[PDB]
Write a protein that binds this ligand. Sequence first.
Ligand SMILES: Nc1ncnc2c1ncn2[C@@H]1O[C@H](COP(=O)(O)OP(=O)(O)NP(=O)(O)O)[C@@H](O)[C@H]1O
Ligand SMILES: Nc1ncnc2c1ncn2[C@@H]1O[C@H](COP(=O)(O)OP(=O)(O)NP(=O)(O)O)[C@@H](O)[C@H]1O
Ligand SMILES: [Mg+2]
Ligand SMILES: [Mg+2]
Ligand SMILES: [Mg+2]
Ligand SMILES: [Mg+2]
Lengths: 278, 278
Amino acid sequence: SYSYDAPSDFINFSRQWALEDFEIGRPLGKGKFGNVYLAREKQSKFILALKVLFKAQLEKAGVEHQLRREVEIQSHLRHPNILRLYGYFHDATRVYLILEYAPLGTVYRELQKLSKFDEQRTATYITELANALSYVHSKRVIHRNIKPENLLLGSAGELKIADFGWSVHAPSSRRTTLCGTLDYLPPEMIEGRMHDEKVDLWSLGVLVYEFLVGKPPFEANTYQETYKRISRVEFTFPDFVTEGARDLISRLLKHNPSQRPMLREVLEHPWITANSSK
Amino acid sequence: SYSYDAPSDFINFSRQWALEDFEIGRPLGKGKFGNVYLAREKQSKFILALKVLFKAQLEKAGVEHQLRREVEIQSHLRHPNILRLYGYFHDATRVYLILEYAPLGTVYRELQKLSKFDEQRTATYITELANALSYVHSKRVIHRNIKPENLLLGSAGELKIADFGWSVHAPSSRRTTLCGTLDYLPPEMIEGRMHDEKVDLWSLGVLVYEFLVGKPPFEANTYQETYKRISRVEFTFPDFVTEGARDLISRLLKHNPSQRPMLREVLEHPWITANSSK
Ligand SMILES: Nc1ncnc2c1ncn2[C@@H]1O[C@H](COP(=O)(O)OP(=O)(O)NP(=O)(O)O)[C@@H](O)[C@H]1O
Ligand SMILES: Nc1ncnc2c1ncn2[C@@H]1O[C@H](COP(=O)(O)OP(=O)(O)NP(=O)(O)O)[C@@H](O)[C@H]1O
Ligand SMILES: [Mg+2]
Ligand SMILES: [Mg+2]
Ligand SMILES: [Mg+2]
Ligand SMILES: [Mg+2]
């Protein structure tokens, strides 16, 4: 049940994929269902990332259909600021995603090192991110999981959107995380609200805030308090956040999704154009 | 922060409550934040249930405000088929709910013993449940957690609705269980859909099915499959479920909440009146 509408054939980086095509290196990270390994295609010596997923853990979590969406959606996207998915294959026990290797790690880790980004580094990242999301949204795809952990850095330090495991086509009501006993709840208590590409515009506004401040705007001790802060749009600005940054953040963190700007208004925002290098 | 609009004064079952007012017996059950104990008020020797909740665990889960709703809502309800909450009190570390003692246990356990209920036992329970939910809904309260574990049995074998920890006033969009990182999700991805008292009509239909069949209609191996079965109303009937029972169940398990019958149509349904003893 692992036949996707996505490439599975050998690629000459200089016949179906096989595990014997790859040399394996250090783990680049640990996912929930397996590790992502630094890898190399043997013939071309091309460096890639090999995401290994265990079929047993995929099925016990019932996530086999969202994996299909991740593979099919990401493999058909071609953008300099989006992580390539060159193809996939599977054997008896594992599924392998052949991913573009991002050498400079996650924006999450870079934010940990630098504590907070200056306005120019932030505006440049937001330009790259808005460009990539514009391309994603032109395909009617919602990423729905935009956050520093899922933003990788290319060899030139540019942003690469990664982790399309939650991506869907707009509009959608699909949930992302399900917890608790559902057996007795009606549909109106388990189904998510209808949402579209404006979801990623909100996440983009959260990123502008955390890039400049060093912490997310709705941070709280419990899930419930964070839930209320988000639902009621309860956040405040430290005094060092400039007026132009406060304007862009406030325009993006709108409870009404239709009131959030188009990505082109973000790219042309005065604070962005004044501080971005791209 | 544990001052509720609910009784906290001593009651003569034959001055504020104190833990010294009660003799403690065996645990009647184990909740998520503490045990429910068989207890006895010393002066009157009146047998009750003492629900003990640890403030430290309540706050680390951020559930202090839903506890207020549970205490305030349940303590103002007076119905023979609803578990009384006589009052509450708290000390430095714990909150105590003084509950009516239900001698014959949960419907859950009775269903485990009998495997499945005959049509007459089922119809009688549904009559008692519909009567109690009619009273609850007359107060514009949604229980939102109707299931066999939360239905207790009085000394005469009658149903008693229990566990109002999820109860709210209609209409509502409050979630019941929150899981996963919310920090980057927009409101439309974390907020629940608007719902009202029709929620409990769906749960009632699930109960009719499980009472007669012995298993819930949307049972599945994963949360995701169960989610899809509920959202798409995917269930089938074993051949022994009679035509009248199939009619009542199908009328209640409507995806559109407004298409579900009033509780009075349930109480007057031909299958109910033909088989209920109440
Ligand atoms: N192409 C890549 N290049 C470099 N590092 C990568 C790449 N893909 C993944 N990683 C690293 O591996 C980690 C886990 O990958 P990820 O795709 O997020 O797994 P996941 O299970 O789908 N999501 P997560 O729960 O965060 O692990 C990431 O946080 C990165 O640090
Ligand atoms: N008044 C009562 N009389 C008799 N048994 C009771 C009473 N209240 C609770 N119990 C038992 O104690 C168990 C736990 O009580 P409950 O009120 O459900 O705790 P909870 O944490 O709010 N929900 P749960 O997660 O199921 O424990 C129940 O399943 C019953 O078996
Ligand atoms: Mg991730
Ligand atoms: Mg993920
Ligand atoms: Mg319970
Ligand atoms: Mg409960």
